[PDB]
Design a protein around this motif. Structure first.
Motif, short mmCIF file in Angstrom:
data_model
loop_
_atom_site.label_atom_id
_atom_site.label_comp_id
_atom_site.label_asym_id
_atom_site.label_seq_id
_atom_site.Cartn_x
_atom_site.Cartn_y
_atom_site.Cartn_z
N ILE A 130 0.86 -1.18 0.00
CA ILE A 130 0.00 0.00 0.00
C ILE A 130 0.90 1.23 0.00
O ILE A 130 1.87 1.29 0.76
CB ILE A 130 -0.95 0.01 1.21
CG1 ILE A 130 -1.50 -1.39 1.47
CG2 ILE A 130 -2.08 1.01 0.99
CD1 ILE A 130 -2.48 -1.89 0.43
N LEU A 163 -6.85 -7.55 2.73
CA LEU A 163 -6.72 -6.14 3.05
C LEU A 163 -7.62 -5.75 4.21
O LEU A 163 -8.71 -6.30 4.40
CB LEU A 163 -7.04 -5.29 1.82
CG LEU A 163 -6.12 -5.56 0.63
CD1 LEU A 163 -6.63 -4.82 -0.57
CD2 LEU A 163 -4.69 -5.16 0.94
N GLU A 164 -7.13 -4.80 5.00
CA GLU A 164 -7.89 -4.21 6.09
C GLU A 164 -7.55 -2.74 6.18
O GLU A 164 -6.48 -2.30 5.75
CB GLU A 164 -7.62 -4.92 7.43
CG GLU A 164 -6.21 -4.74 7.97
CD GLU A 164 -6.02 -5.42 9.31
OE1 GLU A 164 -6.93 -6.16 9.74
OE2 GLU A 164 -4.96 -5.22 9.94
N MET A 165 -8.48 -1.96 6.74
CA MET A 165 -8.33 -0.51 6.81
C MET A 165 -7.85 -0.13 8.21
O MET A 165 -8.56 -0.33 9.19
CB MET A 165 -9.65 0.19 6.49
CG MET A 165 -10.22 -0.16 5.13
SD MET A 165 -9.38 0.60 3.72
CE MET A 165 -9.05 2.25 4.33
N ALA A 199 -5.20 1.44 3.68
CA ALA A 199 -5.25 -0.01 3.64
C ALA A 199 -3.92 -0.60 4.11
O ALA A 199 -2.89 0.07 4.16
CB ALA A 199 -5.57 -0.51 2.23
N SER A 200 -3.96 -1.88 4.46
CA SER A 200 -2.77 -2.64 4.80
C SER A 200 -3.03 -4.09 4.46
O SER A 200 -4.18 -4.51 4.32
CB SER A 200 -2.41 -2.51 6.28
OG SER A 200 -3.37 -3.16 7.08
N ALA A 201 -1.96 -4.87 4.33
CA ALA A 201 -2.06 -6.28 3.97
C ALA A 201 -1.38 -7.14 5.03
O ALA A 201 -0.22 -7.56 4.85
CB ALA A 201 -1.45 -6.54 2.59
#
Ligand code: CLA
Ligand code: CLA
Ligand code: CLA
Ligand code: CLA
Ligand code: CLA
Ligand code: CLA
Ligand code: CLA
Ligand SMILES: CCCCCCCCCCCCCCCCCC(=O)OC[C@H](CO[C@@H]1O[C@H](CO)[C@H](O)[C@H](O)[C@H]1O)OC(=O)CCCCCCCCCCCCCCCCC
Ligand SMILES: CCCCCCCCCCCCCCCC(=O)OC[C@H](COP(=O)(O)OC[C@@H](O)CO)OC(=O)CCCCCCCCCCCCCCC
Ligand SMILES: CC1=C(/C=C/C(C)=C\C=C\C(C)=C\C=C\C=C(C)/C=C/C=C(C)/C=C/C2=C(C)CCCC2(C)C)C(C)(C)CCC1
Ligand SMILES: CC1=C(C/C=C(\C)CCC[C@H](C)CCC[C@H](C)CCCC(C)C)C(=O)c2ccccc2C1=O
Ligand code: SF4
Lengths: 742, 80, 142, 34, 87, 160, 160
Positions: free
Chosen positions: B6, B25-27, B39-41
């Motif tokens: 990201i 993915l999550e915020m 976002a991040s992974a």
């Protein structure tokens, strides 16, 4: 409950919706922003389900589109009767058809193309037609070109009527959804009113018009002195001199003395030795029987008069222990989804067109159809290509029903739910039988090529080597030849001449039909045919079954029908879509139908079509080489694709040189297809970016941004050029070879 | 397996997470946009590599970016 | 957030059987169990292919892939107003809870989770591969 | 031809035995867990 | 159908067509096969003599074959075919 | 020039005229002399005889195949083979390129520039299709004034 | 009513069809030498070898290249025994790759019901070792006995 539901003036007949191109879709109604908008404008033009969610307006759109299609077909028939009336030698061909070729297209003498107006005979110059209209009009009893002009202007009148009805059933009185959902009434009026009364009316034509005129045409009477078709109706003594059963005058019909109608209603079978086409006493008894049978079958379903069948009651009573709750909800499938009915109707129309192709080379229905070999090859080839396209489209709209109209809540534990529940078993066992057929037919061809290459003709699959005689076909052909003596008494002859009942019919010195042999070569090529049909079924049924989801992509139904892929993930998800399975089944339809028409052309140029000299000797076009060369691919390349292509490439400087031009241009369209099929979008997008840079340099940048074609669109363009180029190659090679040697 | 990165051009529109079919993915909170989220992974080992997040990213050029690297049984999408 | 424990006593939806279910990857590598609470007896589309009658209470469904759990899970989050969670079950007996990790779905932001795999630069400020020759690091992970 | 029987020996070994040596030893090698 | 007490029964680890019968032959038939197939047991040993024994057995009948047995050892039996241009 | 005889004195070019009428005369033998298809072949023969008498009168060069060959080097004898119809072409092709370029400038300064390319504004189009007549004086005029080319700072360039 | 899921579980990829769990089919498949889980794997590998050895003489003596000579017994039997020796090496390298020396058994221990059974010894490094020698001795004897009953004793058959 069946009654007329329409409503008045749904949409106003205005040209303001003509000016906005993408009015049907919400995405295209904003106007263009890229060049892909033009392609989605045509891609979503007919897709009425993507326009609105209301099935009523969708059904009205489909009904008026049917009327527009009927208008286009009536314009086409008007053109083909006007071409018979003005630009043909139909009277000259009708005087003597064994020496004058059928021609109905005159070109304009402009750029050297006037050499295409060839010597077809009868003091006439034009393109020799292969559509069979001349033999069709001879079977219709058409004697003059004034009747062709009258049928052309009548078809133009009906085309205006279909255009008026398409405007009327969308803008003045369009039906509601429950009118289209009366499928019992629609089947009752299609079986009885359309196919029953249509067969009855054509039976009446073939009693009064086709039969006496075609009887006088068998007597050598000149068509300018043959009495006109209404003179048989008016002067019934003129009709009675050709058939004495007409002297009784409709009293044996109502007193059940139908055997007294045995003069003109016969179960003869076989071909007319004068013309080489089926008898019209049999074709009139055929149409009277399928009319007294389609009108019986049209009184089956329940509309609003109490008697009949609710077909939901037929379906919901059909349930079995191997299925449980089967056939339930299929009425709700086939009355709330246009694509499911389109899949069934397209499968039946394509398979039916294949039935038409086989039941016309084998039982030629029209006078001098069989001996005009160009007509027979073109009619079989055309109906095979139409039938293959319609069965691939059947699987297409089956898959569109799955991705856009299959409701899983209404379909639990029925046939369709259980077919989806074991689709891995269906596709895997189909995969096994396809691989087994591929080895046991094409590897048999490779084995024959190898041992013929290695100098071992005894190690092959020949009629002289290890034999593979089709004992089931060779028994069913003997069963159909030795039928009239015991299993089908009341027949004068046999159903077809290709069964084995003798009757070497010679019309004009050319072979109409004879007993068709079936040997090792026919076994091998029929196993090729079964293999190719099975593989086409494998890609197409895999696209139908895995349209909803897969082990790979469990949310494939949310992605739609015309989506390219999910992405490069899961190893790569390229061509996961059901559309891409239709796309590959189009190639497998090319392979299947092309080997079908190749087997047809070689099989009847080697074993059927030819000439008969004195003392009963039959010389075929390629004498007896199907039994020995059509077992190897080198024979197919050599004695079919090279020996019979020695008239499409040296046709230059003659009337058949347009077939050479379209042979080469068809190779061009095929190699042009390989540009779109093998390439991908991103390369062409960056090349277009360089071209857009060159346009920005000279200030000639369009505001509609130049884009590469989409991946679904690039595959569509590639398969369209592949089918167009390859089919036009076979069309040009066929229509040059069999015109040249016919 | 696959490496999903990201970048700071993200506007926190959340549609990369909504297009994700394997919950990669999550915020997470952030201070570089109006939405105050990026976002991040974290579960990038569960990434099939389908790039549905890159198809749903409205930022030019993309803020979520998936690089196809070493592929395992997670990123091959197999059930056998 | 305390992760939910798999009860292993809730029953399955009424399903007639499918050939798209658990292959030998379930037996030796992993399989996925999705658990959700239902309002009533409904009919849902099986992500392996087919339709099943889902129960009026809690439901347990065994799936082979993590993508099958989201394809089912987003189906019963938009068509139905059903909160779902799934797990990862290994053949030794360990159940690994997977989603949602904080208890709230990853579309919504939570203060507990941290940024990982996030670059403070853009794509255009990534380094060229010629100046990173023969290293474990690549143009994006630094 | 000097020795006609070495066609009868080496073409069966390099055509049948040597692929059966090479492909079986590679299939062991490519499926070693190590 | 998840249990957490029997992990194999809830995942598909089933002997679908297996049998738990201990023996169905007799001692006379069993002692004959293990005596004869006792030097064929070890995979490393069996792969050695199958490669070395298989290379010899194809080179023997490749060389001891006759004209009627194989056509490549028969040789030409007619005049050679002269090509074009006198070649 | 280039080992090619002129077509007026070429024996192979006169042989192709002889064997083309003879092919068409044998096509005429199976028709009535006053019939309608015989008038088309009689018009074909007069079209052929007009063609061969036109090729020999233009100073065309015929090879050993009896076929007219074009010299495109820029010979003073051979201007109408490539140079004269090439300058006729490039004037017409530059007319197509100038009225399509001037249409895009005229619709870029509009309210909806993309609706004027799917729906081409015919009063705007036809008022500059006349203006494409004098286009070498307007292309090099825009080249000398700098309006033909765009500076590279205002041109979308893909990164390195 | 007839089709069930596999052991009552709808989410395992299989069904209890009549082709799978018949009274006759599940009796058959449970007695075939490959599904005996307690017999030593050299003994049941001799039966897997005798069978396949026998059947393969047929397509090699009736279809092969030397089928039209008096050596058709000798040519096809050694061709049938050649496919035994190749498939023995294919069985050899499979057991080397799949199973490691000293590992466990990659086999389902649980039966159709919930009863616990012993592990199947065939899916081991030593169990597939004795299975490979069982196929080699059984296959070479299955070829030789089918050669003896066809081209030594010469029993009367319609095709031989
Ligand atoms: C006995 C009455 C009858 C008959 C003859 C037909 C005949 C036809 N129907 Mg129709 N239909 C009827 C009643 C009837 N319909 C009923 C009761 C329902 C309502 C439940 C439908 C609803 C229905 C729909 C929704 C559609 C048709 C379509 C078709 C056409 C078939 C397609 C084609 O190419 O055929 C061959 C075509 C022809 C031979 C052309 C004949 C056209 C002439 C003018 C007759 C048609 C008018 C009318 C139906 C009958 C008048 C009889 C007149 C000759 C005296 C054809 C025109 C399809 C079509 O193409 O839509 C336009 C279509 O899908 N039908
Ligand atoms: C829909 C088709 C159709 C139509 C319009 C006609 C029309 C006609 N038939 Mg009929 N007919 C038909 C089918 C048809 N037939 C078939 C298939 C047969 C075989 C049973 C015949 C055999 C037949 C005979 C034997 C005779 C007629 C006759 C009649 C005429 C008076 C009856 C009438 O109009 O009512 C009329 C010209 C009579 C007539 O005037 O002959 C021209 C007459 O004697 N018909
Ligand atoms: C009874 C006939 C029938 C019916 C009703 C339809 C109806 C439909 N089809 Mg089709 N289909 C059928 C049979 C039919 N098809 C057959 C014959 C095939 C095999 C080719 C398929 C395969 C199929 C697929 C693959 C899909 C559809 C889809 C479509 C939908 C809209 C397509 C559109 O907008 O047109 C667009 C029309 C064009 C782009 C015109 C191009 C015509 C062809 C491709 C090229 C030109 C051929 C021409 C003869 C060559 C001339 C060359 C010359 C000009 C130089 C619509 C539901 C699409 C959809 O989304 O469905 C919902 C789609 O994805 N069809
Ligand atoms: C001549 C070209 C060619 C050949 C050899 C193949 C071969 C194959 N195609 Mg096809 N196909 C082709 C072109 C080709 N395709 C193109 C143009 C396309 C793109 C549209 C497709 C796309 C494709 C689809 C989409 C499908 C096939 C499938 C298959 C298989 C059919 C089953 C079969 O015949 O097994 C027998 C194998 C052969 C006949 C190949 C020759 C092998 C010889 C005979 C064996 C001896 C060699 C020896 C062992 C060497 C040592 C087979 C592997 C189908 C499939 O995989 O499922 C069945 C499938 O669904 N084809
Ligand atoms: C790469 C070089 C080359 C190639 C293409 C071949 C090709 C051929 N050889 Mg060979 N040959 C080679 C090198 C080459 N040779 C050299 C250097 C020698 C001299 C010692 C021989 C001596 C030889 C004999 C004695 C025979 C052949 C035969 C043959 C044929 C069957 C294959 C075989 O049995 O191999 C046998 C190969 C060897 C005995 C030695 C091969 C050593 C090469 C250099 C290995 C190369 C590996 C390569 C680089 C990897 C890729 C085939 C036409 C047979 C024949 O004539 O058929 C009728 C046969 O009887 N070869
Ligand atoms: C260079 C490669 C090579 C060579 C030397 C051969 C050699 C042979 N082929 Mg073969 N083949 C090969 C490649 C090879 N093949 C491949 C790639 C293809 C696939 C497209 C084929 C497909 C093919 C088929 C379909 C068949 C042949 C057959 C034959 C035989 C023809 C001679 C004859 O009449 O004997 C007649 C037969 C005999 C004398 C029987 C001898 C059998 C011996 C005794 C086997 C002994 C054990 C063996 C050596 C163990 C090998 C171990 C391993 C290390 C290689 C001969 C044994 C035919 C045959 O009879 O096969 C045996 C036959 O049916 N070939
Ligand atoms: C409006 C007029 C216009 C103008 C002035 C030019 C001029 C330019 N284009 Mg072209 N082009 C246009 C229309 C135009 N194009 C359109 C409609 C297309 C789609 C077919 C393209 C596709 C295109 C390609 C594929 C290429 C160019 C390139 C070029 C350059 C050299 C000319 C050439 O290659 O032959 C013309 C090329 C064609 C493919 C013919 C299209 C011309 C059509 C018929 C004119 C239509 C105008 C009319 C008002 C609508 C030059 C900068 C080349 C480049 O990158 O620059 C060096 C190049 O590679 N153009
Ligand atoms: C017979 C074929 C002609 C049928 C025309 C029917 C129709 O659209 O006209 C009926 C149209 C309906 O009028 C529509 O009104 C709309 C505003 O409500 C917009 O102005 C549309 O442009 C206009 O077509 O009546 C006209 O004004 C006639 C002009 C358009 C017809 C031109 C024919 C060419
Ligand atoms: C073609 C005939 C193949 C035989 C098939 C046939 O006889 O069907 C018999 C069986 C009929 O099942 P039921 O008795 O449930 O059918 C009641 C019907 O009314 C279906 O609703 O059909 C199947 O179960 C399909 C099995 C296909 C098995 C694979 C065949 C390929
Ligand atoms: C005009 C022009 C031009 C030209 C062009 C060219 C260059 C050509 C190309 C072309 C080629 C080089 C080729 C092509 C081909 C064609 C074809 C191929 C077509 C087709 C069509 C159609 C329509 C078809 C039909 C059909 C069908 C559909 C089916 C069956 C068969 C048939 C055939 C019948 C130019 C550009 C110069 C300029 C501008 C203008
Ligand atoms: C060539 C090609 C393209 C590029 C194709 C394009 C850009 C289509 C070109 C259509 C015409 C020629 C341009 C539009 C023409 C306008 C109507 C203007 C008229 C100008 C003349 C034609 C008169 C792809 O986009 C593609 C995508 C995926 C796989 C393969 C390919 C592929 O092979
Ligand atoms: S889709 Fe792109 S812009 Fe939107 S939150 Fe995800 S990374 Fe950021």
């Amino acid at each position: 409950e069946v009654k007329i539901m329409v409503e008045k003036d749904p949409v106003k007949t205005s040209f303001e919706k003509w000016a906005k191109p993408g009015h049907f879709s919400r995405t295209l109604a904003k106007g263009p922003n890229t060049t892909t908008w033009i392609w989605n404008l045509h891609a979503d033009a007919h897709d009425f389900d993507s326009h609105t969610n209301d099935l009523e307006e969708i059904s009205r759109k489909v009904f008026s589109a049917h009327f527009g299609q009927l208008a286009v077909i009536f314009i086409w028939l008007s053109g083909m009767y006007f071409h018979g009336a003005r630009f043909s030698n139909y009277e000259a061909w009708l005087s003597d058809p064994t020496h004058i070729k059928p021609s109905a297209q005159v070109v304009w003498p402009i750029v050297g193309q006037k050499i295409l107006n060839g010597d077809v005979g009868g003091g006439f110059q034009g393109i020799q037609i292969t559509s069979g209209f001349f033999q069709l009009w001879r079977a219709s009893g058409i004697t003059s070109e004034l009747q062709l002009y009258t049928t052309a202007i009548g078809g133009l009148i009906f085309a205006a009527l279909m255009l008026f009805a398409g405007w009327f059933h969308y803008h003045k009185a369009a039906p509601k959804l429950a009118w289209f959902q009366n499928v019992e009434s629609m089947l009752n009026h299609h079986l009885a009113g359309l196919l029953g009364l249509g067969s009855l009316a054509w039976a009446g034509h073939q009693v009064h018009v086709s039969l006496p005129i075609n009887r006088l045409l068998d007597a050598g009477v000149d068509p300018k002195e043959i009495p006109l078709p209404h003179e048989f109706i008016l002067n019934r003594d003129l009709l009675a001199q050709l058939y004495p059963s007409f002297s009784k005058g409709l009293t044996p019909f109502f007193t059940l003395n139908w055997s007294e109608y045995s003069d003109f209603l016969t179960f003869r079978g076989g071909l007319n030795p004068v013309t080489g086409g089926l008898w019209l006493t049999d074709t009139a008894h055929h149409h009277l029987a399928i009319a007294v049978l389609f009108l019986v079958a049209g009184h089956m379903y329940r509309t609003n008069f109490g008697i009949g069948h609710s077909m939901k009651e037929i379906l919901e009573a059909h349930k079995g222990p191997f299925t449980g709750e089967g056939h339930k909800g299929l009425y709700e499938i086939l009355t709330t989804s246009w694509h499911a009915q389109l899949a069934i109707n397209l499968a039946m129309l394509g398979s039916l067109t294949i039935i038409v192709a086989h039941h016309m080379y084998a039982m030629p229905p029209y006078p001098y159809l069989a001996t005009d070999y160009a007509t027979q090859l073109s009619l079989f080839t055309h109906h095979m290509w139409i039938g293959g396209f319609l069965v691939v489209g059947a699987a297409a709209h089956a898959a569109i029903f799955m991705v856009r109209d299959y409701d899983p809540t209404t379909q639990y534990n029925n046939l369709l739910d259980r077919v989806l529940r074991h689709r891995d078993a269906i596709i895997s066992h189909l995969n096994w039988v396809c691989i087994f057929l591929g080895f046991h037919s094409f590897g048999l061809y490779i084995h024959n090529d190898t041992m013929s290459a290695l100098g071992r003709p005894q190690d092959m699959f020949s009629d002289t080597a290890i034999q593979l005689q089709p004992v089931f076909a060779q028994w069913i052909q003997n069963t159909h030849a030795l039928a009239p003596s015991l299993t089908a008494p009341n027949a004068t002859a046999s159903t077809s001449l290709t069964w084995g009942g003798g009757d070497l019919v010679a019309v004009g010195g050319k072979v109409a039909l004879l007993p068709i042999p079936l040997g090792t070569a026919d076994f091998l090529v029929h196993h090729i045919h079964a293999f190719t049909i099975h593989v086409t079924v494998l890609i197409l049924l895999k696209g139908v079954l895995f349209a909803r989801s897969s082990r790979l992509i469990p949310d494939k139904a949310n992605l739609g029908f015309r989506f390219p892929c999910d992405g490069p993930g899961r190893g790569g998800t390229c061509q996961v879509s059901a559309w891409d399975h239709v796309f590959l089944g189009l190639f497998w339809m090319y392979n299947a139908i092309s080997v079908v028409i190749f087997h047809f052309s070689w099989k009847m140029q080697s074993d059927v079509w030819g000439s008969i000299s004195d003392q009963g000797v039959v010389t075929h076009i390629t004498g007896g080489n199907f039994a020995q060369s059509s077992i190897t691919i080198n024979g197919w390349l050599r004695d079919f694709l090279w020996a019979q292509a020695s008239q499409v490439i040296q046709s230059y400087g003659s009337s058949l040189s347009a077939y050479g031009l379209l042979f080469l241009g068809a190779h061009f369209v095929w190699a042009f297809s390989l540009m779109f099929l093998f390439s991908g979008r991103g390369y062409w997008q960056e090349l277009i970016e360089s071209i857009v840079w060159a346009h920005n340099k000279l200030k000639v940048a369009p505001a509609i941004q130049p884009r590469a074609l989409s991946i679904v669109q690039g595959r569509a363009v590639g398969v369209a050029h592949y089918l167009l180029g390859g089919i036009a190659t076979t069309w040009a090679f066929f229509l040059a070879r069999i015109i040249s040697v016919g | 397996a696959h490496s999903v990165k990201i970048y700071d051009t993200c506007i926190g529109c959340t549609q990369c997470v909504r297009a994700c079919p394997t919950d990669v993915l999550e915020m997470v909170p952030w201070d570089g946009c109006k939405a105050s989220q990026i976002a991040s992974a974290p579960r990038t080992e569960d990434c099939v590599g389908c790039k549905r997040c890159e198809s749903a990213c409205p930022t030019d050029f993309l803020s979520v970016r998936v690089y196809l690297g070493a592929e395992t049984t997670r990123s091959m999408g197999l059930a056998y | 957030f305390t992760p939910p424990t798999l009860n292993a006593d809730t029953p399955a939806p009424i399903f007639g059987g499918s050939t798209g279910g658990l292959l030998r990857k379930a037996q030796v590598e992993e399989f996925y169990v999705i658990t959700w609470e239902s309002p009533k007896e409904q009919i849902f589309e099986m992500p392996t292919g087919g339709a099943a009658i889902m129960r009026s209470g809690p439901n347990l469904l065994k799936l082979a892939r993590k993508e099958q759990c989201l394809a089912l899970g987003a189906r019963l989050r938009t068509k139905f107003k059903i909160q779902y969670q799934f797990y990862r079950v290994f053949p030794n007996g360990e159940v690994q809870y997977l989603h949602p990790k904080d208890g709230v779905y990853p579309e919504k932001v939570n203060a507990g989770r941290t940024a990982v795999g996030v670059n403070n630069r853009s794509i255009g400020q990534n380094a060229n591969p010629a100046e990173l020759k023969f290293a474990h690091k690549q143009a994006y992970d630094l | 031809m000097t020795a006609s029987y070495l066609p009868s020996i080496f073409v069966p070994l390099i055509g049948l035995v040597f692929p059966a040596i090479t492909m079986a030893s590679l299939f062991i090698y490519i499926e070693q867990d190590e | 159908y998840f249990d957490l007490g029997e992990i194999d029964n809830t995942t598909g680890n089933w002997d679908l067509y297996g049998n738990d019968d201990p023996n169905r032959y007799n001692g006379f038939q069993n002692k004959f096969f293990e005596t004869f197939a006792g030097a064929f047991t070890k995979r490393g040993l069996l792969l050695k003599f199958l490669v070395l024994g298989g290379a010899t057995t194809i080179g023997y009948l490749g060389s001891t074959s006759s004209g009627d047995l194989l056509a490549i050892k028969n040789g030409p039996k007619q005049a050679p075919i002269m090509g074009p241009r006198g070649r | 020039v280039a080992g090619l005889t002129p077509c007026k004195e070429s024996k192979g070019f006169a042989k192709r005229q002889k064997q083309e009428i003879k092919k068409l005369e044998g096509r005429l033998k199976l028709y009535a002399p006053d019939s309608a298809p015989a008038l088309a072949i009689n018009a074909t023969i007069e079209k052929t005889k007009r063609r061969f008498e036109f090729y020999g009168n233009q100073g065309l060069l015929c090879g050993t195949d009896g076929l007219p060959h074009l010299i495109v080097d820029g010979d003073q004898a051979h201007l109408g083979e490539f140079v004269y119809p090439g300058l006729v072409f490039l004037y017409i092709a530059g007319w197509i390129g100038w009225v399509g370029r001037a249409y895009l400038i005229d619709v870029r300064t509009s309210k909806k520039p993309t609706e004027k390319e799917i729906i081409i504004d015919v009063p705007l189009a036809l008022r500059i299709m006349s203006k494409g007549l004098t286009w070498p004086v307007a292309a090099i005029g825009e080249l000398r004034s700098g309006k033909l080319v765009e500076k590279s700072s205002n041109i979308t360039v893909s990164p390195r | 009513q007839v089709i069930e899921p596999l052991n009552g579980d709808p989410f395992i990829g299989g069904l209890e069809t009549p082709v799978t769990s018949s009274p006759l089919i599940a009796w058959y498949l449970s007695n075939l030498p490959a599904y005996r889980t307690a017999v030593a794997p050299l003994l049941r590998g001799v039966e897997i070898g005798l069978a396949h050895g026998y059947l393969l003489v047929g397509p090699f003596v009736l279809a092969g290249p030397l089928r039209n000579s008096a050596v058709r017994g000798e040519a096809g039997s050694l061709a049938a025994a050649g496919l035994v020796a190749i498939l023995t090496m294919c069985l050899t390298i499979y057991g080397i790759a799949s199973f490691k020396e000293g590992e466990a058994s990659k086999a389902p221990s649980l039966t159709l019901t919930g009863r616990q059974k012993a592990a199947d010894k065939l899916q081991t490094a030593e169990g597939w070792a004795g299975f490979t020698g069982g196929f080699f001795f059984g296959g070479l004897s299955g070829v030789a006995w089918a050669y003896i009953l066809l081209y030594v004793l010469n029993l009367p058959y319609p095709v031989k």
